[PDB]
Amino acid sequence: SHRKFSAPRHGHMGFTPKKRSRTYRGRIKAFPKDDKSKPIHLTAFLGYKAGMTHIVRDVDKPGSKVNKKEVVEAVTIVETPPMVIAGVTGYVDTPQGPRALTTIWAEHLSEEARRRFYSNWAKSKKKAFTKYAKKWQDEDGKKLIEADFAKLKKYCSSIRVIAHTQMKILRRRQKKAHLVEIQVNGGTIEQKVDWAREHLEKQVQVDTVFAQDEMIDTIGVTRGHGFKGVTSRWHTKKLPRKTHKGLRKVACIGAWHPSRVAFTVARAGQKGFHHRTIINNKIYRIGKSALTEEGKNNGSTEFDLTQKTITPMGGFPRYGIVNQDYIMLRGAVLGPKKRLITLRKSLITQTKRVAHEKINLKWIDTSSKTGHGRFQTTAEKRAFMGKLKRDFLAE
Amino acid sequence: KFRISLGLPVGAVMNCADNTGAKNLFVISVYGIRGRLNRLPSAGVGDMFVCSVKKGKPELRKKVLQGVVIRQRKQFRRKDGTFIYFEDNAGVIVNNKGEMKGSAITGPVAKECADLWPRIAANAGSIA
RNA sequence: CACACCGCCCGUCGCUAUCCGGGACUGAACUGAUUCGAGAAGAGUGGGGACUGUGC
RNA sequence: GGAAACUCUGGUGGAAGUCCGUAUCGGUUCUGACGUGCAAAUCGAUCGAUAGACUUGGGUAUAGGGGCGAAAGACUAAUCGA
RNA sequence: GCCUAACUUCUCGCUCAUGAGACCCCAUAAAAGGUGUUGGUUGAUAUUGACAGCAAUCAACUAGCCCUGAAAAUGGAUGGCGCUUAAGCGAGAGACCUAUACUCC
RNA sequence: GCCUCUAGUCGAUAGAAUAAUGUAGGUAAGGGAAGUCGGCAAACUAGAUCCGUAACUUCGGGAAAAGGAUUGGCUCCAGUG
RNA sequence: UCUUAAGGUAGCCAAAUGCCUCGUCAUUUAAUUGUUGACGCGCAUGAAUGGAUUAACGAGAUUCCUACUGUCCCUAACUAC
RNA sequence: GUGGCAGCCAAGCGUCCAUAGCGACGUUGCUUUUUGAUCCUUCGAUGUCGGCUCUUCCUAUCAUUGCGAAGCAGAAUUCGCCAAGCGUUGGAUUGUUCACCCACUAAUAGGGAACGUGAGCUGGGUUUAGACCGUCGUGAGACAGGUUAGUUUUACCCUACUGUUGACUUGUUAUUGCGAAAGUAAUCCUGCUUAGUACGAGAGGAACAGCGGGUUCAAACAUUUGGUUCAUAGACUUGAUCGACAGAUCAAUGGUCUGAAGCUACCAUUUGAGAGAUUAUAACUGAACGCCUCUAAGUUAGAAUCUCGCCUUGUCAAGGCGAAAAU
RNA sequence: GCCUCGAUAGCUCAGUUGGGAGAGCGUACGACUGAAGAUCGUAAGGUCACCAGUUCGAUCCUGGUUCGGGGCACCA
RNA sequence: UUUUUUUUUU
């Protein structure tokens, strides 16, 4: 018997199974199509979701009701310290797909890059790449490495550099670095291999990968919520108050026939910590490291002249202080604070106006995100509140 | 008009802010709403709705009329990031084309409603 | 009764017109009072002291 | 106050199968809990009555086609159209 | 033909279907249609040059296969895979396979 | 009802953790029964003093009708043997 | 005019009693098979098989107004077990 | 049979005109969402109406995409084709399925799944025992006539489904990858301009492109606004205790106010898109059939359909396949 | 929606194989009366709801359109 | 014993 009144099904069946992500790091399931004519460039980067804030900007959208008006928008800060290129790998097409042909590592790998190969680095003898390093200063090893480079130049249709994050400069607990394969776009295969070889053991900055007012994609694992019932996992209607045996359930989980529960029915299980790829996040600013002179005031704008860094009053809650380069994305980003976000260039050929709109920041909020912040800087707070008993006793 | 939070579902009773003699406006339905199962149509400032007078002159009662929302208590967000709300829910009786039946409005009128309805803006004293 | 008992005349019922009453609907409208709640404005008093005369 | 009949005002008094409510006696609704229970009928909240046609102990009387019944075929030792 | 023991065995035709058809009971199909193709019936014209354009043709019928008529609910049934001068439809020929039946021990 | 004194108890298998569903409590913006067979459940009301109280009525009631105001602490004033 | 022992009187009614039926009109609503008031050839109302009313009373059945609210729009958080 | 749906011939309707759209008298079918007929299974029991909730499926297509035909000059409307991808609502009365009305809407299409769905709920109806009325009966009692109240039990098993670990095999340990297979997602609308233009007696009244927004759906997130407070955080306060002050305690969270953090709301905010082959259809060249002809061979354009991409899974038995590190 | 029933003059009703449209009220006139009312006589009142068909011939018979009237229409 | 009526104006 047909259901009396129609209603769309609850949830998107193309995002199932709602299971925990296989990996903590976001996997890049597709890279932007390679165009041989453009200059050689990287297609992805790694950052950490520091926190959120809000900004004021002037909108240039002809025909809009907010044209030449100021609007307040929420933004997310992603700290993106420079990465280190530690290896080169290439892929050869086969009847069953692309296949990795060879990998050449840099002569000197950082301790934090090598940690990634370990679960007990401190307890171990740290023998990783010890014999490989000697091959770079050997007659036969040099020949083998050169042959690998020749193979990459001659047979591969796609080139990727293994890059790794740097963790010591962040002054935090973790030291193990994150490795990731990033495809190189632009130029021929030979040029890509030469470029990767030159950049082996070298640092790449985020401003060389992403531009301003550019739409990018964020790949990563969402915020986890553990085991959850149907009412929260799938957002089904709650049952009446008079329901015996519970109302936060799905009343009917199938008809008599087929005499089985279908995979399309809502069931309780893991909610959150799902792999996701959100596209079309606009870059509002690429700020420089606050430890350098250029980034000394990466929290100010052309119209807000106060000297301040991006980090809000009292630090980013549950994250720390953003002292490296950062990207200010518009809106929400998947995952909690401290989560590792993989930034990828857009696979789409952007044509909407929002993609090419120029962002003009007028002001960036740096008030405390714990409590209801009333001041933008400690100097402003002290100037407003005057002098306290602590200062009196300090005198 | 941008999206704003709606705070007047079907069945709400708001004040009639014009001088037609009606004192109450009972929300029957909201124009432009093709809802979902078990969802009450809701209206916010600047929305036309089907109403009926529950208290007022006998000539206006027991019949179906049209109104427009001019003030709401549910706080809503403007594009400049501010959150604004009024002290009461209010509306004005209008015809099917937006002409206001009355001639004067008591109290302020939301900017969102004023922009959409020129006649209501004209008859409004203050615009907030 | 006097058209003089083939006089006169009374009610119900039926038709038309018209006036009024009762009447569910906590019916409706206008208007005046009174209690209570809020309360514009002025005036009185206590502060206040922008400004300017010689501690006042 | 009144011609009278009698009327009015303020107290006193403490009646009623009167009222609210504790102990107590019941068992309305949640059609709540539990429903291989704490329990072969209980538990929680909410409820009816609460100075009488009231609630109760003990001793006594009525015994099965009989008893007893403000009456439901109710009860008569977890057994009742025998 | 393979599941499956026994032929991609031999002869002549017919059929192309944007899921054709495929074997008693048996597992549905009709009235009505086609200038798809293949045979036949009848009546005409044509070398005293038949129709079309500025050397056979015309018309009406008929019946084989194919097509339309032909819509249902979990994903699904010539038994399945598949098969197109067939591994389909009709007429036939050699051989071959196989019962607890027949002959013999 | 709540707290305490005398007297008596800490007897209800314990520990860690605080997922879903549950049982029992506590809240919720704007709307206010649109939910549902049905306002089921919950919420609302309430003590005391002063004031005020309708239809109807078997004249006894209705009635705590409805509905308003006040309520703390401290320092005093007055009355009542 | 047929006919009975008598032919339902006073009242009351689509009722806890009316099939047709969601009767017809008015009232309540934006909208009503619901409520209430009327009408009455009433399948099949009716006078101690009691009729018609009726103040007060009711863990009785029903309709509406107001207050109130997570019943709902549309769910969320917290506590004990 | 009945119910529902679809055809064939044309007597007529349609100003004239059988076939735009219909189609009588007749007649051929299909369906099992009606109701009957039967009695095959179930009476050592298959829980028997409806609603709520939630999936999936079918189309006999209401809307939307692409089209053909009109008695198609356009809001509008009708007929038909390819088409179930995606939608198909809020309510008053009634237990109601139906029905009817109010309102919005792109539209308010029809159905199946043991008349889907009671160890999912509810229990309004039906459907025991109590009780009332009318009619019937001498009576006990009867009444798909009306009325009121009437216990809704059990999952810890197997499977299915949802998530979570995880061994053995290709030596071991981690690192970094490929895609097989499986899932798959977006939807409808408008304010301005087009334009009072096209159009032409007017009345009336469009579209494609462009700009800005929204509905439904989906995936996230907490900077802001909002909600939650045994943070048992700060303040206050009633009652009682510790001789008083101060400090505190108890009242199963004593109560009131504010309340970070975390969680969380279309109650805040952010994000949601491309190709390929083609269907219907319209055409090209072009015979059959010396002419014609979109068709026969061969060619074009072609869509909410289909396949793929993007996106989710990827303990995968020819134990799926690589690179690379230390052993 | 289904079973149906009916539609006749200004209004209300008869009527036919199918072979005529009648009756009453109402309307106009005449008689009657001093004049009226009443009463009588005449004149009268119609596309037989509409369309198509079948028939030598239809108001009647068949089909359709309109208008209405009476009934039937889950479930456990 | 029974014994009801008599249009309008003039």
PDB file of C-alpha atoms (C1' of nucleotides) in Angstrom, chain E residues 7-73:
ATOM      1  C1'   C E   7      27.404 -33.465 -34.937  1.00  0.00           C
ATOM      2  C1'   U E   8      29.221 -26.275 -34.289  1.00  0.00           C
ATOM      3  C1'   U E   9      27.236 -33.238 -39.317  1.00  0.00           C
ATOM      4  C1'   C E  10      24.571 -33.019 -44.588  1.00  0.00           C
ATOM      5  C1'   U E  11      20.383 -30.469 -48.200  1.00  0.00           C
ATOM      6  C1'   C E  12      16.728 -26.549 -49.591  1.00  0.00           C
ATOM      7  C1'   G E  13      14.316 -22.280 -48.222  1.00  0.00           C
ATOM      8  C1'   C E  14      12.211 -18.183 -44.731  1.00  0.00           C
ATOM      9  C1'   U E  15      13.304 -14.412 -40.821  1.00  0.00           C
ATOM     10  C1'   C E  16      16.544  -8.655 -38.502  1.00  0.00           C
ATOM     11  C1'   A E  17      12.898  -7.609 -34.307  1.00  0.00           C
ATOM     12  C1'   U E  18      16.346  -0.127 -30.175  1.00  0.00           C
ATOM     13  C1'   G E  19      16.371  -7.547 -25.656  1.00  0.00           C
ATOM     14  C1'   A E  20      13.094 -11.665 -32.504  1.00  0.00           C
ATOM     15  C1'   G E  21      12.307 -16.636 -31.678  1.00  0.00           C
ATOM     16  C1'   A E  22      13.020 -21.199 -29.801  1.00  0.00           C
ATOM     17  C1'   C E  23       9.043 -27.864 -29.049  1.00  0.00           C
ATOM     18  C1'   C E  24       2.195 -32.000 -25.998  1.00  0.00           C
ATOM     19  C1'   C E  25      -0.201 -30.913 -21.179  1.00  0.00           C
ATOM     20  C1'   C E  26       2.275 -25.604 -20.212  1.00  0.00           C
ATOM     21  C1'   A E  27       2.299 -22.026 -17.864  1.00  0.00           C
ATOM     22  C1'   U E  28      -2.164 -16.176 -21.935  1.00  0.00           C
ATOM     23  C1'   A E  29      -3.374 -13.106 -26.201  1.00  0.00           C
ATOM     24  C1'   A E  30      -7.702 -10.857 -29.670  1.00  0.00           C
ATOM     25  C1'   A E  31     -10.599  -7.414 -33.136  1.00  0.00           C
ATOM     26  C1'   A E  32      -7.852  -4.525 -36.329  1.00  0.00           C
ATOM     27  C1'   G E  33      -3.368  -2.823 -39.272  1.00  0.00           C
ATOM     28  C1'   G E  34       2.121  -2.420 -42.343  1.00  0.00           C
ATOM     29  C1'   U E  35       4.226   0.307 -49.692  1.00  0.00           C
ATOM     30  C1'   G E  36       9.254  -4.976 -44.279  1.00  0.00           C
ATOM     31  C1'   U E  37      10.226  -9.179 -47.106  1.00  0.00           C
ATOM     32  C1'   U E  38       8.852 -13.879 -49.557  1.00  0.00           C
ATOM     33  C1'   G E  39       5.564 -16.943 -52.372  1.00  0.00           C
ATOM     34  C1'   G E  40       0.805 -17.466 -54.897  1.00  0.00           C
ATOM     35  C1'   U E  41      -4.609 -15.986 -57.216  1.00  0.00           C
ATOM     36  C1'   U E  42      -7.350 -13.031 -60.396  1.00  0.00           C
ATOM     37  C1'   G E  43      -8.055  -8.942 -63.960  1.00  0.00           C
ATOM     38  C1'   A E  44      -5.615  -5.584 -67.033  1.00  0.00           C
ATOM     39  C1'   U E  45      -1.740  -2.780 -70.295  1.00  0.00           C
ATOM     40  C1'   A E  46       2.683  -3.664 -72.959  1.00  0.00           C
ATOM     41  C1'   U E  47       7.079  -4.490 -78.464  1.00  0.00           C
ATOM     42  C1'   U E  48       0.947  -1.527 -83.998  1.00  0.00           C
ATOM     43  C1'   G E  49       7.304  -0.191 -78.065  1.00  0.00           C
ATOM     44  C1'   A E  50       3.779  -0.664 -71.066  1.00  0.00           C
ATOM     45  C1'   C E  51       4.476   2.974 -66.170  1.00  0.00           C
ATOM     46  C1'   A E  52       8.317   7.699 -64.473  1.00  0.00           C
ATOM     47  C1'   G E  53      11.055  12.194 -66.277  1.00  0.00           C
ATOM     48  C1'   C E  54      10.971  16.730 -68.555  1.00  0.00           C
ATOM     49  C1'   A E  55      11.321  -3.556 -70.888  1.00  0.00           C
ATOM     50  C1'   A E  56       7.931  -5.201 -68.350  1.00  0.00           C
ATOM     51  C1'   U E  57       4.169  -2.405 -65.748  1.00  0.00           C
ATOM     52  C1'   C E  58      -0.547  -1.481 -63.127  1.00  0.00           C
ATOM     53  C1'   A E  59      -4.595  -2.977 -59.661  1.00  0.00           C
ATOM     54  C1'   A E  60      -7.147  -5.891 -56.183  1.00  0.00           C
ATOM     55  C1'   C E  61      -6.590  -9.942 -53.214  1.00  0.00           C
ATOM     56  C1'   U E  62      -4.375 -13.952 -50.620  1.00  0.00           C
ATOM     57  C1'   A E  63      -0.739 -16.318 -46.575  1.00  0.00           C
ATOM     58  C1'   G E  64       4.395 -17.551 -44.553  1.00  0.00           C
ATOM     59  C1'   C E  65       8.044 -15.042 -41.230  1.00  0.00           C
ATOM     60  C1'   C E  66       8.762 -10.003 -39.082  1.00  0.00           C
ATOM     61  C1'   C E  67       6.567  -5.464 -37.161  1.00  0.00           C
ATOM     62  C1'   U E  68       2.278  -2.277 -34.403  1.00  0.00           C
ATOM     63  C1'   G E  69      -1.938  -3.401 -31.440  1.00  0.00           C
ATOM     64  C1'   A E  70       1.092  -5.500 -26.270  1.00  0.00           C
ATOM     65  C1'   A E  71       0.744  -1.306 -19.250  1.00  0.00           C
ATOM     66  C1'   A E  72       2.644  -3.379 -12.672  1.00  0.00           C
ATOM     67  C1'   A E  73       4.590  -3.116  -8.901  1.00  0.00           C
TER      68        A E  73
END
